[PDB]
Design a protein around this motif. Structure first.
Motif, PDB file in Angstrom:
ATOM      1  N   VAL A 113       0.863  -1.179   0.000  1.00 39.63           N
ATOM      2  CA  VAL A 113       0.000   0.000   0.000  1.00 39.63           C
ATOM      3  C   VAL A 113       0.900   1.230   0.000  1.00 39.63           C
ATOM      4  CG1 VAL A 113      -1.497   1.338   1.436  1.00 39.63           C
ATOM      5  CG2 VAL A 113      -2.117  -0.994   0.908  1.00 39.63           C
ATOM      6  N   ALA A 114       2.037   1.125   0.673  1.00 36.74           N
ATOM      7  CA  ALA A 114       3.098   2.101   0.506  1.00 36.74           C
ATOM      8  C   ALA A 114       4.046   1.641  -0.591  1.00 36.74           C
ATOM      9  CB  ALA A 114       3.849   2.305   1.817  1.00 36.74           C
ATOM     10  N   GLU A 115       4.946   2.526  -0.970  1.00 35.07           N
ATOM     11  CA  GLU A 115       5.985   2.144  -1.913  1.00 35.07           C
ATOM     12  C   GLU A 115       7.123   1.414  -1.212  1.00 35.07           C
ATOM     13  OE1 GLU A 115       9.081   4.897  -4.466  1.00 35.07           O
ATOM     14  OE2 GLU A 115       6.921   5.339  -4.627  1.00 35.07           O
ATOM     15  N   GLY A 116       7.347   1.709   0.063  1.00 38.65           N
ATOM     16  CA  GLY A 116       8.342   0.990   0.831  1.00 38.65           C
ATOM     17  C   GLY A 116       9.754   1.330   0.385  1.00 38.65           C
ATOM     18  N   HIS A 117      10.731   0.731   1.074  1.00 38.97           N
ATOM     19  CA  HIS A 117      12.137   1.063   0.846  1.00 38.97           C
ATOM     20  C   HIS A 117      13.033  -0.154   1.043  1.00 38.97           C
ATOM     21  CE1 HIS A 117      10.787   5.294   1.207  1.00 38.97           C
ATOM     22  NE2 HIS A 117      10.045   4.805   2.184  1.00 38.97           N
ATOM     23  N   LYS A 118      14.206  -0.047   0.437  1.00 41.13           N
ATOM     24  CA  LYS A 118      15.294  -1.014   0.462  1.00 41.13           C
ATOM     25  C   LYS A 118      16.462  -0.302   1.141  1.00 41.13           C
ATOM     26  CE  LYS A 118      12.671  -3.477  -2.304  1.00 41.13           C
ATOM     27  NZ  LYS A 118      11.452  -3.188  -3.128  1.00 41.13           N
ATOM     28  N   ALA A 119      16.506  -0.330   2.460  1.00 41.42           N
ATOM     29  CA  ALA A 119      17.591   0.389   3.097  1.00 41.42           C
ATOM     30  C   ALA A 119      18.957  -0.305   2.883  1.00 41.42           C
ATOM     31  CB  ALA A 119      17.275   0.571   4.574  1.00 41.42           C
ATOM     32  N   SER A 120      20.010   0.486   3.046  1.00 41.35           N
ATOM     33  CA  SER A 120      21.390   0.021   3.066  1.00 41.35           C
ATOM     34  C   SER A 120      21.958   0.336   4.436  1.00 41.35           C
ATOM     35  CB  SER A 120      22.233   0.742   2.022  1.00 41.35           C
ATOM     36  OG  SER A 120      22.350   2.070   2.465  1.00 41.35           O
TER      37      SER A 120
END
Ligand SMILES: *[C@@H]1O[C@H](CO)[C@@H](O)[C@H](O)[C@H]1NC(C)=O
Ligand SMILES: [Ca+2]
Ligand SMILES: [Zn+2]
Length: 441
Positions: free
Chosen positions: A327-334
């Motif tokens: 529902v969100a785009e979300g993230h790929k953290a480093s």
């Protein structure tokens, strides 16, 4: 039927940390008065012989969360370790005293259809498989295309060399004894649990391999230990809030790609992002240190945090519809990978500060606090509603671990439009299956 006991960590079937199902939650057993007779009650319950070993002090890795049982004292006659007498106060107990067993189990005696070939190490080599070709018995190789840690784990298991430490898609540097220089298995994908490479999905003797460097064949490297990362669920629960942050403070975060796409057109001088902040405290609960796959040359400077990031995709951060679509785009953290605090008397080692070596020591955790940049899901675009928050650690199985069934975390999330409630936060596979159902309905 629902099992009430299981083993985690540890390389061989029939070996690992004892964990027990009590009140719908899995949880560990403290090792005070841990004994061989009790241990062998769990070995029998899972249907192997009996305990070679009553392992103490978390030697096969730690758990997080509830310590259910303590000072087990089975007679030996119990059908299940949940029937033995136990002391129910574990207060003096922590997760460096999680008990474990090494059960006597059969070894499928010798391997003749699979081998490691080349290399100076018994623990590594190109993986070769015996086949029949034009009447002769010949050794050939496996397609390296999409060869990962999980397949590697199955090879190391089948060969009795413990865990996988690495998998290799193209091997040209390995000599060994005469082969046929011909790919002979291909398209292999393993679930993880298979007992021999051939029992994974693979196309059969119709072995489509690409033409390139992947035609040399997959290799593995195996080790008797491996790290085991866990997220600290209680903590993303305690540390969650909303902030609407003026854009003029997110200049760094924008360029480091920590915002959802609508941020492109958001007013720098006058604008919001609504940021669901929280803390990610990742533990190393396995049997060795967690280390980045690459050396320093591959690490990338994080402008906001002002340290190097040795894992470019350490986590998936997402908010999801209850069906499971984002529902969100979300993230790929480093992530910078270091020891910010350790358990008991363990000694902090890894440090990011001065291009330091990166990694998380056995027994320590690495905490990325809620106020640090990029610890959020941008939620500006998201309407009020009833969602699932999820965090996956090591999501592409990029670095070897003793357990991937614990790298997912989910919370139920009720969003007002004005505030958010995160509840029922937990590590996937820490509940009973029926209970795991009730958390989505
Ligand atoms: C569930 O996901 C589907 C995607 O197929 C979407 O169409 C639907 O709106 C979602 N349900 C709700 C009410 O969020
Ligand atoms: Ca793990
Ligand atoms: Zn960082």
């Amino acid at each position: 039927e629902q099992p009430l006991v299981r083993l985690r960590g540890g390389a061989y079937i029939g070996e690992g940390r004892v964990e027990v199902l009590k009140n719908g939650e899995w949880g560990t057993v403290c090792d005070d008065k841990w004994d061989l007779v009790s241990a062998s009650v769990v070995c029998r319950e899972l249907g192997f012989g009996s305990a070679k070993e009553a392992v103490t002090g978390s030697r096969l890795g730690q758990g997080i969360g509830p310590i259910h049982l303590n000072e087990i004292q089975c007679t030996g006659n119990e059908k299940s370790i949940i029937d033995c007498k136990f002391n129910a106060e574990s207060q003096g107990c922590n997760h460096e005293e999680d008990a474990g067993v090494r059960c006597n189990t059969p070894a499928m005696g010798l391997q003749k259809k699979l081998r490691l070939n080349g290399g100076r190490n018994p623990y590594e080599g190109r993986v070769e498989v015996l086949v029949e070709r034009q009447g002769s018995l010949v050794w050939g190789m496996v397609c390296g295309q999409n060869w990962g840690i999980v397949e590697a784990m199955v090879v190391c298991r089948q060969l009795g060399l413990g865990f996988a430490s690495n998998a290799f898609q193209e091997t040209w540097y390995w000599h060994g004894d005469v082969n046929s220089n011909k790919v002979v298995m291909s398209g292999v994908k393993c679930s993880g649990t298979e007992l021999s490479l051939a029992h994974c999905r693979h196309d059969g003797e119709d072995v489509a391999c690409p033409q390139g460097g992947v035609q040399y064949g997959a290799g593995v490297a195996c080790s008797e230990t491996a790290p085991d990362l866990v997220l600290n669920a209680e903590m993303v629960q305690q540390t969650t809030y909303l902030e609407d942050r003026p854009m003029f403070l997110l200049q760094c975060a924008m360029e480091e790609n920590c915002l959802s796409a609508s941020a492109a057109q958001t007013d720098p001088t006058t604008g919001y992002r609504r940021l669901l902040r929280f803390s990610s405290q990742i533990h190393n609960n396995g049997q060795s240190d967690f280390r980045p796959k690459n050396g320093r040359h591959a690490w990338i400077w994080h402008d906001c945090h002002r340290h190097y990031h040795s894992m470019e995709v350490f986590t998936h951060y997402d908010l999801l519809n209850l069906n499971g679509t984002k529902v969100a785009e979300g993230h790929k953290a480093s992530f910078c990978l270091e020891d910010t605090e350790c358990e008991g008397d363990i000694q902090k080692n890894y440090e990011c500060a001065n291009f330091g070596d990166q990694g998380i020591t056995m027994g320590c955790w690495d905490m990325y606090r809620h106020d640090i940049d990029c610890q959020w899901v941008d939620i500006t675009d998201v309407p009020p509603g009833d969602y699932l928050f999820q965090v996956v650690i090591n999501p592409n199985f990029e670095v070897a671990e003793s357990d991937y069934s614990n790298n997912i975390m989910k919370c139920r999330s009720r969003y007002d439009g004005h505030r958010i409630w995160m509840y029922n936060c937990h590590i996937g596979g820490s509940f009973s299956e029926e209970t795991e159902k009730k958390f989505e309905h």
